[PDB]
Amino acid sequence: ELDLPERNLDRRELRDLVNELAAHPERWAEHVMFPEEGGRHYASLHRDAYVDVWLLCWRAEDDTGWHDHDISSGAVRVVAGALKECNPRIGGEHLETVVSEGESFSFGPDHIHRLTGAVHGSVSIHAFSPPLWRLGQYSIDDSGVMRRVSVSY
Template identity: 30%
Template sequence: MSASPVLPSSPAGSPSAGSPSAPGPSQAELLDFVRHVAADAELVASLPIDPEGRTWVRLDGPGGSEAWLIGWPPGTGTGWHDHGKSLGAFMTAAGELRENSLAVRLPTDGWKTLELNAGVDRERRLTAGAGRAFGRYHVHEVLNESPVRHAVSVHAYYPPLPLMRRYSRSGQTLRLEQVERPADWQ
């Protein structure tokens, strides 16, 4: 993976970082932000593309949120993960992504392996201009399944990611594999 510098990209009228007592952006505000950025064809086209691995540029999100513009080469994905206590939203800006998610609230701490009930799996296909918001502890994986086409997406999280938990999955068994902190991916 390769990293790029921070690019400011707050839409006009979006909440600013403001005072520490100001509430952070809502899921709807994060979704509005990623929608606005995904529609910025010049910014999306400026993302460096690597045929071997994902690339990203950090953006200034609304209200002190953390945001990223991410490039997905054909056949790449995130693996199963969550964003801890952060709310989030993402939108596909180019290409198509698939999100697999779990429609169940998992315990936040104190476990290594869980057996999932039947019927908790959800799948979304997100073409350019399609996205979604999600709440705290949302477990999902995002994939570019195209064999030939890059995808680009915009992601925003509030509060800025304190951690990400990575999981492996075999059938209905979900296993906590690793906890990453910001220093691990910046």
């Protein structure tokens, strides 16, 4: 439990949150784990009615896929390693951005992105507000038409 307001957080507060937490390894160091081949390691660092905070440990094999967070704003802090944040572009020229250790970014609830290209041993802290309850997972058929599946997580 942290000293946060009794409400949903905007993306500026979420960014400060992931960084403040990166600066307190005492609360996330023990949850680091790189499954040799299970699923992308999730570790709840704090969950309440207003915020979900996760620690993610990445293998080179991990990819979120194109997705959105419905109504949830979000922030990411790379603790170690580096991630690839891609934002969709109609036309196929998808904007791609390498986010290196020490760096962080945030976004509002309308964000569509994909996290991948994780160098082995990468560690990141992800916070969502309101809590992440439903996501939209996009897919493109062989023909080219795009879909959005609402999923539970």
